[PDB]
Amino acid sequence: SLSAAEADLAGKSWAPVFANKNANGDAFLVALFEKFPDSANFFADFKGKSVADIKASPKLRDHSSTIFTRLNEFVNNAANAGKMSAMLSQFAKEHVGFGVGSAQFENVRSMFPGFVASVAAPPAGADAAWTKLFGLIIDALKAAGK
């Protein structure tokens, strides 16, 4: 889990992103697919399509809102080590179930702070909080197999 200070920083930098949830979730998933294009092959709905077809698919919103809803839950429970511990091992089992491993979350981790900051300049220290949150997810995936 994150410390109280990291959780607070993550929460503050996430609020303006989540306030325009639908559009920012779509733009997140599109940014992830543009510059890690094999990410799209893990999704049955997107496998084989170019990013232009994904941008126009109505399934974009389904997957992006699901991601932002559960990311929101992680952010607001981040400093609760027992809740975090159970959420992470949910999350890891579900993703290993779809063939997703830690390498894919290393990719998310590398772009996430820059995505958040392009919606709104975050307080100082917010990237390291986000980096640590994804490192917990990456660890849980490794612990669950890959």
Ligand code: HEM
């Ligand atoms: C960015 C952080 C992410 C969060 C918070 C997240 C969250 C979720 C959630 C809540 C689900 C639905 C689970 C269920 O219904 O059982 C899901 C499904 C899925 N996720 Fe993730 N996800 C993230 C990143 C990724 C990444 C990076 C990949 C692969 C590159 C991925 C691949 C998938 C796939 C393939 C599914 C199943 C889609 C379907 O067929 O409905 N997710 N994700």
